[PDB]
From a paper:
Crystal structures of the two PUL-encoded carbohydrate sulfatases provide key insights into substrate recognition by these critical, and therapeutically relevant, enzymes. The data presented here reveal how the HGM has evolved a core GAG utilisation machinery (PULCS/DS/HA) to target diverse GAGs in the human gut.
Whilst BT3333-S1_156S-sulf was only active on GalNAc6S and is the first member to be functionally and structurally characterised within the S1_15 subfamily. BT3333-S1_156S-sulf also contains an SpII signal peptide but whole-cell assays, using GalNAc6S, indicate that BT3333-S1_156S-sulf is periplasmic. The structure of BT3333-S1_156S-sulf was solved in complex with GalNAc6S and displays a pocket topology. The axial O4 of the GalNAc (the unique difference of Gal versus Glc-configured substrates, the latter having an equatorial O4) coordinates with Oδ2 of D173 and NH1 of R174 (for further interactions see Supplementary discussion). These interactions probably drive the specificity for GalNAc versus GlcNAc substrates. R174 also coordinates with O1 and the endocyclic ring oxygen through NH2 whilst O3 interacts with the Nε2 of H225A. In BT3333-S1_156S-sulf, however, occlusion of potential positive subsites is achieved by an insertion between β-strand 3 and α-helix 4. Comparing overlays of BT3333-S1_156S-sulf with BT4656-S1_116S-sulf, the GlcNAc6S sulfatase encoded by PULHep, reveals that the two substrates bind perpendicular to one another and thus no interactions are spatially conserved.
Author numbering: 32 to 206, 207G, 208 to 511
Amino acid sequence: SQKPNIIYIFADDLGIGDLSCYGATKVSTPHIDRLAGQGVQFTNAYATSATSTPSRFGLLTGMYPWRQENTGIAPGNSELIIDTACVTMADMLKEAGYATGVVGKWHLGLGPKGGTDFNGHITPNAQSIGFDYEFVIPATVDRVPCVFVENGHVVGLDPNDPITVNYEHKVGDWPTGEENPELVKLKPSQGHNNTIINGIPRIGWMTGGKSALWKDEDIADIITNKAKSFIVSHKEEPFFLYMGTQDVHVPRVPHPRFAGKSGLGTRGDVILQLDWTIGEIMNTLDSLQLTDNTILIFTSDNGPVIDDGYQDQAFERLNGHTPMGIYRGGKYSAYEAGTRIPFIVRWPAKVKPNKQQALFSQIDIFASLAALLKQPLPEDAAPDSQEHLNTLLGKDYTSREYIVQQNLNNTLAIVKGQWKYIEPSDAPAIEYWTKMELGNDRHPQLYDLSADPSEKNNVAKQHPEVVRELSELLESVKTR
Ligand SMILES: CC(=O)N[C@@H]1[C@@H](O)[C@@H](O)[C@@H](COS(=O)(=O)O)O[C@H]1O
Ligand SMILES: [Ca+2]
């Protein structure tokens, strides 16, 4: 064929150390390892951000999320965060002649100023920014409402039982973690004490849509089947599938057939469920003879977290597993494990198996696919996205000049050749809930990653001219 199919899969909070192809010894990921073996495994690939909403925003817009105020972790009832006049990756692939679909985790908002009204046609939605087809989890599985949205309508919604959602105060009289601990089956470790759904207290309050409520143990199966439907439906045409798994995000509710199979508790169990999901996508492609001329990109939105809010024994069951690999920090953090993510590109027709050590950022995927397809961008489109197609395909080992990282508190860090600079911040050093090291410091930090990849040795006092140059460089990206 001329024009490859494109599948982009965000895992949720999957760590640079969670996969056996990245050296995990305490858990085995044979489907994802097989994918690695068939394509290009990246060892220096980064998301824009150490959290969900901003990394997904940066990927789809080709604009750094920290250039817009509303791009932080979004509530389940956030208005759509991407302006409908923005050119998205989905829009440019639609212009390039692809059928476009989003399946799974969205977390970019739905509906207009005021927040999501879940009770009729929800607009603007993913279809307002270049997706033909939409089947989404509004935000995260730990956030209300716990329902799916398909082409702008809640699946199984009864108009006589309308939904209301509120993140400021209780609406309705549904049990909560706070008031009704007797009805809590998975106890919260950190907040998560609002409306209970299926015995799991969630973030935010909801009432109504009883018949629309999902079953947590079926979410991977539902996402996997809707992804396969989309692929089977577009067997004969060029398609783009943007897919977001729930795994390995809290609450971790493995299907019974994975539950207790890892021996790392539910956190390990959903790594195996995730590996099985990617296996199902690879088997579907193979079935339809679409393997060879499909670009399959598998990555994560941000780094990993052990205890992210439920008493699921993820620390107690960890068994010497290292989700962060050697790296400092994790989810939320400006330290490397915040934005360092697993990243695999398989395109058998065109791309030989390889390890890509080059510096790569998810911000460049938009301009890199546009360049591949020779698709022209409006002057204002994908403004921070550089063409690095050769690097993406393992055809060159040319690093990005620098990459930019954003933590929870919008502290930015820049990596240039061997050097990592973290700009000063007044935000807390330690994240209140998880106690994660955020890398917020009133003083500059400088790490030589070639010598000190675990960021053990701040050498800012040793290299003021390096701090000054990288500081001036980061400020010029900000004011560009
Ligand atoms: C105490 C608490 O509420 N913690 C939650 C965490 O559980 C998770 O839901 C996170 C977003 O994760 S992300 O991957 O979608 O950014 O938001 C935090 O606020
Ligand atoms: Ca995430």
